[PDB]
Design an enzyme around this catalytic site. Structure first.
Site, PDB file in Angstrom:
ATOM      1  N   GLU A 191      -1.220  -9.584   3.821  1.00 19.34           N
ATOM      2  CA  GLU A 191      -0.998  -9.993   5.037  1.00 19.34           C
ATOM      3  C   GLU A 191      -2.466 -10.275   5.500  1.00 19.34           C
ATOM      4  O   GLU A 191      -2.328 -10.755   6.575  1.00 19.34           O
ATOM      5  CB  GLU A 191      -0.573  -8.623   5.630  1.00 19.34           C
ATOM      6  CG  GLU A 191      -1.341  -7.536   5.946  1.00 19.34           C
ATOM      7  CD  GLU A 191      -1.470  -6.699   4.649  1.00 19.34           C
ATOM      8  OE1 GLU A 191      -0.791  -6.931   3.591  1.00 19.34           O
ATOM      9  OE2 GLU A 191      -1.638  -5.323   4.909  1.00 19.34           O
ATOM     10  N   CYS A 243       0.880  -1.015   0.209  1.00 22.32           N
ATOM     11  CA  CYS A 243       0.082  -0.137   0.010  1.00 22.32           C
ATOM     12  C   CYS A 243       1.014   1.370  -0.089  1.00 22.32           C
ATOM     13  O   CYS A 243       1.556   1.392  -0.810  1.00 22.32           O
ATOM     14  CB  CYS A 243      -1.037  -0.091   1.234  1.00 22.32           C
ATOM     15  SG  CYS A 243      -2.231   1.138   1.295  1.00 22.32           S
ATOM     16  N   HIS A 275      -3.331  -6.034   0.041  1.00 16.45           N
ATOM     17  CA  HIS A 275      -3.160  -6.477   1.358  1.00 16.45           C
ATOM     18  C   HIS A 275      -2.951  -7.978   1.536  1.00 16.45           C
ATOM     19  O   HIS A 275      -3.562  -8.524   2.035  1.00 16.45           O
ATOM     20  CB  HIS A 275      -3.939  -5.890   2.389  1.00 16.45           C
ATOM     21  CG  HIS A 275      -4.036  -4.555   2.448  1.00 16.45           C
ATOM     22  ND1 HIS A 275      -3.303  -3.679   2.805  1.00 16.45           N
ATOM     23  CD2 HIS A 275      -5.248  -3.788   2.141  1.00 16.45           C
ATOM     24  CE1 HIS A 275      -3.471  -2.467   2.766  1.00 16.45           C
ATOM     25  NE2 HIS A 275      -4.717  -2.517   2.400  1.00 16.45           N
TER      26      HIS A 275
END
Ligand SMILES: Nc1ccn([C@@H]2O[C@H](COP(=O)(O)OP(=O)(O)OP(=O)(O)O)[C@@H](O)[C@H]2O)c(=O)n1
Ligand SMILES: Nc1ccn([C@@H]2O[C@H](COP(=O)(O)OP(=O)(O)OP(=O)(O)O)[C@@H](O)[C@H]2O)c(=O)n1
Ligand SMILES: Nc1ccn([C@@H]2O[C@H](COP(=O)(O)OP(=O)(O)OP(=O)(O)O)[C@@H](O)[C@H]2O)c(=O)n1
Ligand SMILES: Nc1ccn([C@@H]2O[C@H](COP(=O)(O)OP(=O)(O)OP(=O)(O)O)[C@@H](O)[C@H]2O)c(=O)n1
Ligand SMILES: Nc1ncnc2c1ncn2[C@@H]1O[C@H](COP(=O)(O)OP(=O)(O)O)[C@@H](O)[C@H]1O
Ligand SMILES: Nc1ncnc2c1ncn2[C@@H]1O[C@H](COP(=O)(O)OP(=O)(O)O)[C@@H](O)[C@H]1O
Ligand SMILES: Nc1ncnc2c1ncn2[C@@H]1O[C@H](COP(=O)(O)OP(=O)(O)O)[C@@H](O)[C@H]1O
Lengths: 534, 534, 534
Positions: free
Chosen positions: B507, B379, B505
């Protein structure tokens, strides 16, 4: 002059050191020139602590007047000079016994005896009794807040507080601020709830004590202050330390005593805590170290010999020497043997009850005696040493005590009535501080520097005079005799570097500031021996 | 098929890991072949977590459907294969917003809106909604028992327990059995009181969880069982561990899940926890070690980058390599400089909001790029890398985002409407899992082994496009583009050993059982680099 | 000058009359010459009382500033001459609306909004706002102690008590000392527990109010004093009485106010309660009696017309005449007919919303008009009377309101925008105290003795002036008009002994000490008519 009271309670978990905190405060109050005393109420059905074992609660303190009481009364003796008595400690069971007896003899005139008001009356009357004539009275409430075991006491207090007025009472409450390593921080929630619990029974805390293993941040103290209706300055942090003798310093540091006198409108002089500062300095800066081995039975819970441990520490303070206590089970000396006793600079044998491996204790006494290793025997340890010497030096085969083997044949210890010789020819408990005539030519007389001394007792059987003459004539010095019956209070071994054993309990008089002659002598001798062996 | 519910509460202190415990249980229930799901109720007034900072609560979890929610929802994703949605988490404020809106619309027909009913009804309906169609539903109650912050929720539960019937619901409760080194033992009194508190609000616990730093003795568990009206077999001990993936093993070891199926009359096949046993084996037996430095802003609280940290861990598990994380403040790289970035095998730059020391982030991106040091951007970190490359390779001096500088003159990042070139010529927010078109010739395409990939988003500004052609033509590979507007989703550096930066993202998609290609590649690259630099 | 606060709470049961007690106290403190004000905290989720029906909570009080609020605010107006405003009453829902809106606006800068401290701060601010500039502020806490519905408020209070200081705050608490006829005595146990509950949340009561149907014995008051930590003198007994205007006398009798001034160090002058004594005397010694019918809709719950009932009472006090209200369901007038209206000395028609029995209301208006029976119409009653006269005298077949019929054909009542004639040619809510222009030649102008008056309003629809000339010219007196558009405010019937009707709400201005010209005239007319018919 009107007596002021401070009540001490604790919540969350037990074993926070309520007696320690109270004693430390009292020490300060004494240091400020105030007539302070202290009492403890115990949440137990047991009427007297003498009905319980040493392993159950640890050592049972012997007061001057012979009363058996809570160990913490001895702790109080080590911080303030005000003497404790039977009026300074009693139990729930004690109360019921008294009240029921009053019922039985018609003292309530046909009325219903109820917790409220009759049990609480018994309590509050005892409190007023003990607090008579004092400026400040600390009252420790045992048990844990929120438990039913002490709610009657808490109620009696509430009532009392109202009766005497807030100007004569403060509420000090101990809590726990636990550290949570997983979070990396301490928590306060438990404390908040503990306070709420006191509030639910009519008690609003004035002073908070935050027990922990580390200083509690002012921010956290403020958070607590908020939720508990307590001023920030009345929230005291109390981290764990390596010596109780340092606590007065901490409490003083946070202004606790100033707050208290302000609350009681007292013009209190500045506390002189230098006596303990001295002790602390000396404690933290010994010039040497020495290994003391102790042989006994209740070593599975050091509390059993707490008073002894403290007394040893005090001897060490006066001789600036670290005292290393080895815990030895008499039954192991009995089993494994004297190999256990190797590597020691000196050996000590405490009192207590129970036959158990006492023969190993005797073996130990023999060992220390025959190998010239400094030795200190107390109560039972004297009985042990007596048997040792008698059987192996005076040739009194099976020297023993009638309390274990009535038919001894050489009952070196027996009830005065039971005194007898090996041919069967003959002719309760001694308690409290009693005068002992010391032999002017003895070491102990000179250690105390006085013709006679006064020391505490607790035992039932005595040295059997019928056979004593064999033992003493064989080469043993009676260092002192009691009084009316000239009972063998204390002995010394003629050619031993330092072998002393006695009937009395010197450990109930020793303090961190005054010390005590027998521990000064024992510990010093221990060090000397160590050096002689090096 | 009837849905069964288990409620999870915690008392005494916070930070016990209620979400972790629940998730571990759910993993087991999944392993038993049961349709298990999970929801979390929050005691917060904030309607949405988007109104709070990451320093305040840590990373905000992004669900598949774009909802922003509690971090623990990601934790749930790391234990079970079901998907969290907006229905799996809501706050107190959320409830009031909805209810007050119903008030406004006349939905209560002139009636008084009370806490009971109405507010608790809203809660009950939301629970039934989320648990619809599942065999077992775990519900985590935020807040601490005894605090007013969550009493309404506790009440709603009580009601449902009655409405549903106890045959379909269980009460689980976490406590603390703290270790008191001063006493040398753990205490159980706090626990006893926590249970009493639940009882006072109509809740009788069925299962107890004893959190501590060590196994709690059976004797103590029995003591608890007594005072809490709970069977000994339902008192579970949970000592601290070095990995949350070992907990399912422990819960299984103590028979927790068997108890549960018995209570719900379920025929449950033996749990297959070998998936995590594998993970544990691999976790505890890495073959290598790498150091990754992370440059950011909220590094003072690891929770802020929790999802990222765990994603790094997951990559390390698959490559059997230990992962060290250096916490670097971008403002220090800005101040002190790149000396901070020395001694690292790889460079990590995460997402977030705030200018702060972003110039140091840029400095870092430049450092890693220029020195060929395994770089990963996420990001904002991608936007940073974009700027870095743009300013020093594409020569776009002052490249930046319009969100910080209205007239950058080189706005490499801007809103779609705001897209413009350096001459001022021109031409809401993206959340949730979205399909991205990967470039067949890119590494990332091959990392996922697929033409496209669906990944989660949370961000408002996009790559300009007007100036993109300067950057891309200067020598930067767009490794993948979005959908309708073909927006630069991910880039790679042509001659850098391993340089990947993206808008999505990853993660929030990695798991301990599957890992995640980009972290696998990143961490591996760190190792490669490490070995090369030797 | 520093503001002092007294908080009023209550427990055990609801319906004790907390507002009544507080109001009576305020009256005394007014009589002591103090700047007294009062606020009430409403535990309900409804933001505004306007979202609830008359049957739900009875009449809704209209304040001077147009705010709609709790009925008790009108009760406050009947004991103290100060004015209530929107600042004197707000709800739980209101708080959340405000806080959530602040959140939305970024007011908490990314922080977690929590009950503590954010919701409680909202409360704290509102309290300080309302009490600003006053000597004594009474704060009534709604809800019941121990219920979760008001714990946040209780917490906010606790905090303020601490922050402000005890020297400026007192805790008053109402209880129930119920009479147990089976035992033949009252019980105190409930009270003891109620107090314990306050204590558990950090609140220690200072003043106790014992509600019962009979005086509580001093012995019992003493028992309470004991268990609650409260002085005997602060335990006030409050038996049920037949008039709320006798309460100031009782509270004064027990020395309540003296205690209070001592607690606040105020040199308070002897209370002049003779004004109330006068009211009481007159109340207890009327010279006559009249029966007044009340035709309406919410008569199943007296509270719905409470303000009206009391206004009637006050008129009766001034004329020394008993007021016997006959509750009549307008729907029964539609069913049974005008036979219901027989045996009455006067006819009254209260305001409200909803059609229901409105046609029966019209029938009643007609009945009273045509039979010359002392008629008083308020708001809706005026609308009804307008229709009556219009349809049966001005020949306006189906005279009606557009709020019920879209095409009335003779819309005598409509929104100003909606004003139209019978041929379809044309051309929010009025709240609070508004100035009305009285016609100098009208009865009510002379009853008030003033050119203009100021009276409270609460309605959206108005007299349709397009058709007014039909009605007025037919032979009907407009006794008053309003302001800018001279809207019809009061109407009188030319040849009726006493028939009036109005748009405003005179029942919110009437007091027990001042009375109110309109009701004085109405009730007087009832008597006159009674004698006329005898
Ligand atoms: N509500 C209850 C429950 C238990 N107890 C007290 O609870 C105490 C138990 O705690 P503690 O004394 O500290 O020692 P243990 O019983 O071993 O347990 P723990 O230390 O965990 O409290 C006992 O003394 C018992 O008298 C009580 O009085 N009231
Ligand atoms: N009786 C009370 C008092 C406090 N709180 C809650 O107490 C919490 C604070 O405790 P916690 O969340 O654990 O964190 P801190 O406030 O930092 O303090 P601590 O961890 O020691 O409780 C706040 O969220 C507040 O909502 C409440 O609801 N009811
Ligand atoms: N432990 C509880 C139980 C009830 N309520 C609140 O209790 C109020 C209702 O009690 P009350 O006003 O006294 O009237 P009822 O509910 O009809 O019952 P009662 O009068 O017997 O209490 C409701 O507003 C509800 O929100 C609550 O806050 N906490
Ligand atoms: N928290 C308290 C307070 C009081 N009591 C009990 O309270 C009872 C008194 O109440 P009760 O028996 O009902 O009769 P009275 O004392 O006359 O008072 P009342 O009936 O109003 O309770 C006493 O028996 C006393 O044992 C107690 O055990 N615990
Ligand atoms: N702050 C302190 N530093 C370390 N431990 C302490 C301190 N104060 C309390 N303690 C410990 O508390 C224990 C007191 O035991 P105990 O007699 O059970 O306490 P209580 O008086 O609470 O019954 C001791 O082991 C003592 O070391
Ligand atoms: N038994 C365990 N071993 C160590 N710590 C754990 C274990 N389970 C719970 N925790 C810790 O609990 C914390 C969870 O944080 P947080 O999200 O605040 O918990 P909660 O879910 O209770 O809000 C983590 O730091 C985690 O390490
Ligand atoms: N001592 C008193 N005599 C008789 N009843 C009283 C007295 N004080 C309070 N009340 C009664 O209390 C009631 C108040 O009702 P309500 O407004 O519901 O109470 P609250 O304001 O406490 O909610 C009235 O019916 C009133 O008659």
């Amino acid at each position: 002059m009107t007596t002021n009271y401070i009540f001490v309670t604790g919540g969350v978990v037990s074993s926070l050191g309520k007696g320690i905190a109270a004693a430390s405060l009292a020490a300060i109050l004494e240091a400020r020139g105030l007539n302070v005393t202290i009492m403890k109420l115990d949440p137990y059905i047991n009427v007297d602590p003498g009905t319980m074992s040493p392993i159950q609660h640890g050592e049972v303190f012997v007061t001057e007047d012979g009363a058996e009481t809570d160990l913490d009364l001895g702790h109080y003796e080590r911080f303030i000079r005000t003497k404790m008595s039977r009026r300074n400690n009693f139990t729930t069971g004690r109360i019921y016994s008294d009240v029921l007896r009053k019922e039985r003899r018609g003292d309530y005139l046909g009325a219903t005896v109820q917790v409220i008001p009759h049990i609480t009356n018994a309590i509050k009357e005892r409190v007023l009794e003990g607090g008579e004539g004092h400026d400040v009275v600390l009252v420790e409430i045992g048990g844990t807040v929120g438990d039913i075991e002490s709610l009657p006491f808490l109620e009696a207090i509430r009532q009392m507080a109202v009766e005497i007025g807030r100007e004569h009472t403060l509420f000090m409450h101990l809590t726990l601020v636990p550290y949570m390593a997983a979070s990396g921080e301490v928590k306060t929630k438990p404390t908040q709830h503990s306070v709420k619990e006191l509030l639910s029974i009519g008690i609003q805390p004035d002073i908070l004590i935050c027990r922990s293993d580390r200083a509690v941040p002012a921010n956290e103290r403020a958070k607590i202050a908020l939720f508990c209706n307590v001023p920030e300055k009345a929230v005291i942090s109390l981290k764990d330390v390596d010596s109780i003798y340092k606590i007065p310093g901490l409490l003083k540091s946070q202004g606790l005593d100033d707050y208290i006198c302000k609350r009681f409108s007292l013009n209190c002089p500045e506390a002189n805590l230098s006596e303990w500062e001295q002790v602390i300095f000396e404690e933290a800066n010994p010039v040497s170290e020495v290994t003391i081995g102790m042989v006994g039975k209740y070593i599975e819970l050091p509390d059993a010999y707490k008073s002894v441990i403290e007394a040893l520490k005090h001897g060490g303070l006066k001789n600036r020497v670290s005292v290393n206590i080895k815990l030895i089970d008499s039954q192991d000396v009995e089993t494994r043997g004297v190999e256990i006793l190797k590597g020691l600079d000196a050996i000590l044998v405490p009192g207590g009850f129970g036959y158990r491996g006492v023969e190993g204790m005797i073996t130990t006494a023999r060992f220390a005696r025959e190998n010239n290793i400094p030795y200190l025997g107390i109560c039972l340890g004297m009985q042990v040493a007596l048997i040792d010497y008698a059987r192996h030096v005076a040739n009194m085969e099976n020297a023993n005590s009638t309390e274990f083997v009535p038919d001894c044949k050489y009952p070196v210890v027996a009830l005065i009535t039971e005194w007898r010789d090996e041919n069967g020819n003959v002719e309760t408990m001694r308690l409290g501080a009693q005068q002992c005539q010391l032999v002017d030519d003895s070491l102990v007389r000179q250690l105390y520097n006085a013709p006679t001394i006064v020391e505490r007792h607790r035992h039932r059987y005595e040295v059997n005079n019928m056979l004593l003459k064999q033992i003493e004539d064989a080469g043993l010095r009676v260092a002192g005799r009691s009084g009316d019956d000239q009972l063998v209070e204390i002995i010394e071994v003629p050619n031993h570097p330092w072998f002393v054993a006695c009937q009395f309990h010197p450990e109930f008089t020793s303090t961190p500031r005054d010390g005590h002659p027998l521990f000064a002598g024992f510990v010093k001798a221990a060090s000397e021996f160590q050096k002689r062996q090096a």
